[PDB]
Symmetry: C3
Subunit: 148 residues, 3 copies
């Protein structure tokens, strides 16, 4: 069971879109992509990881308002209506002086092993205000899971 | 054979206290937590990972004297003397303006495969001055090992 | 089948050199180092990871140049054209004010699962300007692959 997705920001849907048919993406052993969510085949331990790369416009009107870079993986269940934070990484953005603006680049990576159930659905959750700022080029942004 | 620990700052012992009994923590197949160290069950190859999440005050007075974000995994073995760094990561903290306020957030994540021996002990080594500021809200700070 | 390499800045040659015989480095099951490339034994899914650590003087010249930290893993395959980015991570460097110094420290870590073929070769690609400042001590800079 292994799966690696590449992702990008979409114009129509205001979301980060994962794909299993582009670049170095692949699906194997039951792990599969269904509506920007990874479906777990069986109960067991899986390693889950994600990266999101950003080019931030920054600038004073956007940084007097405080906005952090947050990248999380959310489980999904039919056994629960809401969502639960499997894990998340959070960083302060625009670590420099405002008027002098210039593009600021940063990447968040996290990975961990979890005790997941058959039928669990995993999706990502990145700061909505920074979504128009995600890169794709070559595996700059990805999502993947493998059975341990 | 896999272990996932969550950690928080312990105001009493003044240590990053890894636990296997909170959040998404689990121990399986022989890997276990004994006095802040992961004990290795058998000889073999293991993937080791750790994330530390910090919210730094930063100040002006806690600054100037250059303090760095450093997180490492140390290996203790019956095959040698004291401890050796399996790996470590380091970052410059507080890169925002001195007198200006706001809490600074930064996460550090490391993960690699290593050849280990039965009875081996893994522990973490994080910048002591920044320990009070570790953030253990739902596994933002974790330590885990799994056998390959 | 796993391999972990440590890396350092050659001074004689201006390159990031991977070593399979220093610190916690090891080779197992057919994964081997030939030049600065990891040779893949058989077809299959492999987890790939790499971390690079830098301490930069910083200055003003190379601040207004707006140079950024970039770390990528490239794949060489007969099944493809030239080299292709399995993944990459970019980061804004020196985010402090220039005239006052201290050295600026940062790290970039990447890891993901990929389907690779027998005879495939993996190498790294780091910002060539920053190569003089890669840390070679402990396990700050490394490259590794393991079969899933």
């Amino acid at each position: 069971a292994a799966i690696h997705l590449t992702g990008g920001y979409n114009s129509e849907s205001k979301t980060l879109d994962w794909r299993d048919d582009q670049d170095q993406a692949f699906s194997s052993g039951g792990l599969k992509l269904v509506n920007r969510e990874i479906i777990i085949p069986d109960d067991g331990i899986y390693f889950v990881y994600s990266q999101v790369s950003l080019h931030i416009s920054c600038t004073s009107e956007l940084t007097e308002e405080q906005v952090l870079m947050s990248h999380a993986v959310m489980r999904f269940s039919e056994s629960y209506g809401g969502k639960k934070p499997l894990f998340s990484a959070i960083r302060s953005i625009c670590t420099q002086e405002p008027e002098s603006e210039n593009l600021w680049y940063n990447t968040i990576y996290l990975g961990a092993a979890f005790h997941l159930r058959e039928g669990d659905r995993l999706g990502t959750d990145t700061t909505t205000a920074l979504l128009p700022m995600v890169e794709n080029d070559n595996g700059k942004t990805f999502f993947g899971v493998f059975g341990l």
